[PDB]
């Protein structure tokens, strides 16, 4: 203990036929105060992995440094650091999962909920979750915080089980992710309009999109809504 | 401390083909101490049967209350109360004590004398009606009863087959509960005959 | 839980029930509450199941080391004190243990030590521990004699657990009987309480309150 | 108050109640009679919180005596026990409940049967061949379960009761200063002055 | 919640966001926080939604009965009725209400009734969780006797900032204009005010 | 801490520090033990090079380890006190935990174990 | 230990009226008490009420107001209005300061038109074109926010409503089983569509557990007298 | 305040046959009222013909299984590739669990396999390491729903032979692997109906002298 | 443990200690000896928390026996009581303190005087003509204050002790199952086997 | 406390009020909250006075030892040292620090380190209890590459409003200007800024 302070909200993600997509907004909240508006919560590791982090931002920055140090360390005395002995999404996740569970076991957790998204050496999609308790799980769609309640239902309508993954294109997957981010902006009071989105594809590699915005919003219907029951004017 | 598990006990009710069954254990205890092995939890008012689990003082009080009310009902209406009507009376009566409730889990069972339709219903301590087609469970081994009934039950069982199903549901549920057992009773109810059977079970 | 042990002319009788509960939920009816420390020593399980199992198996290891080093059977006094000194080190940490360490040696004769997780170590003739201990004490106290036969002593231990199994909601399942002699303990079977209750009711005429 | 025991035999009900009254540190009395005669053939013993025990018992006694005079008739033990249960069931949801547990030993002159009723402060009534309140049952019920017979004589009941009291005196930490024993039968209520 | 009422040359305008939260969940993103207690007496509500609705409904009843007997009530009278309910029941209420109205004799008037149930007549008032972030801005930018268009801009800019920083505020900016000409409702959408 | 290996093997397989400790024993006053059928007698030599000695208070050569066991020695007097103290502590420790006094063999095995330990521990002779 | 069920309840406005829908799971803690309860209730013939929270409080409050609405309708010789039910509900709930844990979606038609409100246990009310309540409200609202539009037809609104309920059924553990729907159109009778969808049918068991007769040990038999 | 524990739901079931053993578990992983995964394997082949599941708090469950698998590896290193018998594995798991007696693995562990006579074996553990060989054991969320059914249908409890009326018990005849699997499937189908945390999928690991085989079945997803 | 009494008369110290061992509900033993011989002419009785009482007593016993062997000399009662006080004073600021109260009855062979020391678990030592721990003093000290004389014989001390035990048996709520009485004098320690 | 740091064309300026309170008592009305950790690296302190002084003293030591070995540290390096102390000891510290410095290579830089011990590089930063009231004002009025005089006016106007509304802020407005030309201290008294 004691408490998360400056925090990031939902991280959402899903698998598709040739890879994975992950997204997270650019807000750092300070309670109900929307304090920091340019926080990047997707952190790429190499060209095959993107780690999405929610929760305490100070701990996120600590994890960000651990990953940076992991890349440095892997390159030491390693002629194949950019080839066969490069960091895999599975290596990066297992390392973080170890750290998270160790920290909770000392009663001094990193406060975060983490999603590691990537593509393995053999082209396999990697998508797994880990949090402050060291709890880990995998699913065709994964989301943290509010995303778990609102994004997953929408993303699961696209990929409801393992056999739906090969039938899902990157265009359909990205469309679903972007819509979910809009829904979260409507309904999560600790969300922002600005977000980042990353695609890790086994053919086209890592595509990192910054400064995206929620668009095509429906608000017009608000003009007709008056009072809270009996009021007509 | 928890009023609904001081005395212990269970009730289960099931529907069959042109019949209903309601059953209960016979234990009354003071927490770990067994006090009585003859504490029956099923009562009847005419052809309508009521099982009540929970705090034993309230079980007794509610039985006396519903005897009181169904007796006045009969004098005024000039007919015996039906299971559907009685269910509403139980619900009403429990909800009138919304902020000082009886700590009970009542179960109604019976056959409508005019339509011949089998009827069962359950309640929480505050009057919320559970009107299941298949079965109703109540008491300190309700989880165990849900497990037994869900696997053992099938619809349209004949009276003598329903007896075996409900008996085995009760017995094996009660044997996995410290505060239930010490004997058991099963009522098999048909439109104009009711049979009551006391079961043999382990006495620990 | 109901566990008892008593000294008599023919050694020690150890009798236990078999029920383990988690709240009102009966977790098991087949729990082994007598721990066979070694062929000569027995311990009873009450309080924490793990604490009793673990530390009384550990005790068996310490007893084995003792007799390897000293070339002599460990006394019940020494064996019980190894356990009580151990749990006393852990006092305050939250160990839960109420056990009877039972043995029969040359120098001591039949000996029982009540050992307990707050550090208590009591030598005695009759001990009864568990949620149903008061019921078993009643049958024990009114029927106990030093000059009981092995057969009658075994039945008394069996009947006393049955008394507890009947009345105590958290005792039952089956009865396990042991007879501890100088040459080692002898197991006297598992007895289902359900079957035993009716058998005893008929043969003894007891439990007239219950319809059979 | 502490130990109160009851046993219904062939032709009578026997109530045994401890004599000690302890106010914290000291035993203030060792001859206290924890019972009230409700009617000629009905006796009630009681135990619970100080003050409330006697206040409740005397309140019940006054009510049954009033009924007896109004109707020129003695209520059955069953009827008296039902009246008592209702009062305790009423009391448990009061502003300040009576913290009183009772045993009602009566001889029904109509049915020619002894009857023992056990009622706790919640209004939990049970008719029993033998009963107790508090920890008394924990020590005594295993003995009663073993030896009890429905056709026992009054003398055999007293002997089984002595065995129960002996077990209490052996294994109970508290000194309850012995018991006062009373017998309820067809001839009414009498006290066993040597026990 | 971000609410305000501003007097200007031709009368008074009430402004509000439309976000209602249960913790971090937005239960209603299109709430109408501008409520009518009389023809030209309105109020902005903050605090417990149940409490402020209950109070407003009672006030509307009181002013309807007042009107039947004594004719149109003053804005001061409406504020007094609000205060009476808020003050006398302060122990059981969480309500922060801004009362705004237009008379022909008195013109535009604003009264704020904070948590304690006190009354304060002001040229303009701000309230709700989002108001904290615009005390500086509003104090620097408010002028007396502004035009309708200036007052709309002032409220739009003020509530834009309150919404920007306060997570409990958001959605659309609703406004109600009270003048001799009548009652006009205005609405402004995120794509409009976020780029200010 | 001082960790120097004083007791070590020589090319011929001898530990000279242990063998030189025996030479210190050879210098010590003679001690003798004889066991009868129902007794044991410990005899000890007192060198008469020291007169004007106060025999009341001078350390006696035979020491009680417990009420039932005794220890005599030959060699360095100061060294013997350390072994005697350890033996006495162990005797009470044994009574405390086993609830029985030490056997003579056990007490011997303990003292012999302490002596051995000082032949392959660093920084001790 | 009173019933508080998991639920997904929704309300959707359309062209010529309003539709409400609900799942059919009633929970006791983690245990499913009723696998096919009816969460759609009547207040008046053309005003219906979906309820969540404390089950006893939702039913009790809906019946009490429904009773007073009927008497009010008879007294005024007029068909009852949704705003009357709304006002009576919220003033009742507010008086008890949230101790009556009733959370409702109210929906219906009346001479004034079609209406859709939500009521919260403490006595606050909201207006909307689409609303959701229950433990699966977030799952349902995600669907409503994704697919809702202005000028929905009858058939579109039923599809949207049931899709929102399905999101709750699959993704929320508190909700499950079937989908109930009630459609209230202007100028027509309200049509209650009990078990409109049944996508969670129990599969055939691998074995029959019908016991041989005589399996259960019996101590005593006796004929019970139900007659006078 | 930081709570180091959580509840991931799930239900597991171990049954020992005459010359086989099954360890089954649902594949659903949850927190509160949300589904984390519809397929997250919970029963694991640990080598040496031993299958294991640690149900409850999944982080502690994964840690324990991992440490046991590691213990099997080092047992081979230290003891000349000797096969770890099911009884030895059970005692080893006790020590792993009791090692954290004052900060326990919040799980209910069950292992299954064959004993050294080739007979089916199941061992059941509490969070702090107390264990027992058992014939039949359900663990986790719906254990209270399943065990009474198993008492009745595996051990024939409260069942007597018709005509005798309680005098002769129904004889305890041995069940085949096909018969056990039927009872496992019906246990989980029933548990899925009445318990909200049970569903999605059922994975069964069957152990015989030939090795470890897997079977998967769909469960309702509501 | 419950009642422990001590009285120093002309030529001896007499320690009386209850025989009951109660572990909550049941009296597990009624013949428990709550004392340890520290040296031939020094006896220590004890009462306090379960386990710690015996553990402390035996630990002290081992230490005094060790001193006796090392020096071939018996420590004075004063010296032993000071050693015991320091151990308890050390213990009270430990991680887990010994919850043990003791009486030390010794005969000083140098001064030819009996000596009684009362020490509580805090390390509060007092030399007294008579002493107790717990509630024992509340019932007995008024009798001792009245009857005690410094020139009493051992037999008179035992008679005054009997009066104290009788008052305890009358007014104490707990059944302590009588007392074991031991006498410490110039000839050592002996137990009065009929009391 | 009301503190801020603003980058501008020629470098950076730090601003602060001078009020230090113990409850409602003003323990020091002339506090200097602008502290020097290196020649042209300063910081503004908020939170526990004991904590922020202790941290600042340690940082000043670290940068003095850094300078002896490796030459002048960057503002980023100073912020990193602050963050290391604030993050690693987050459980035992209540410190909100704004770090401002001038390099010749990097020019004016501002880093804010809030309670949790995270770092945020910003064009300008505001902190302290009084900052809440000027989020709206500062966001509307800040421009990049302002002149020295404009930045002084921006800070003066901002902290004036923070002081006006926040009871925990007050006294004089202190400022420190960091440019290539050197280090300049400024002070502004109540009679000056209250009339703005
Ligand atoms: Mg049972
Ligand atoms: Mg039992
Ligand atoms: Mg906002
Ligand atoms: Mg399910």
Numbering used by the authors:
A (entry chain a): 1 to 233
B (entry chain I): 1 to 204
C (entry chain Y): 1 to 212
D (entry chain J), I (entry chain X): 1 to 195
E (entry chain N), J (entry chain b): 1 to 196
F (entry chain Q): 1 to 125
G (entry chain H): -5 to 222
H (entry chain Z): 1 to 222
From the paper:
Yeast strains carrying the single mutations β1-T1A or β2-T1A, or both, are viable, even though one or two of the three distinct catalytic β subunits are disabled and carry remnants of their N-terminal propeptides. These results indicate that the β1 and β2 proteolytic activities are not essential for cell survival. Regarding the β2 propeptide, Thr(-2) occupies the S1 pocket but is less deeply anchored compared with Leu(-2) in β1, which might be due to the rather large β2-S1 pocket created by Gly45. Thr(-2) positions Gly(-1)O via hydrogen bonding (∼2.8 Å) in a perfect trajectory for the nucleophilic attack by Thr1Oγ. As proven by the β2-T1A crystal structures, Thr(-2) hydrogen bonds to Gly(-1)O. Although this interaction was not observed for the β5-H(-2)T-T1A mutant, exchange of Thr(-2) by Val in β2, a conservative mutation regarding size but drastic with respect to polarity, was found to inhibit maturation of this subunit.
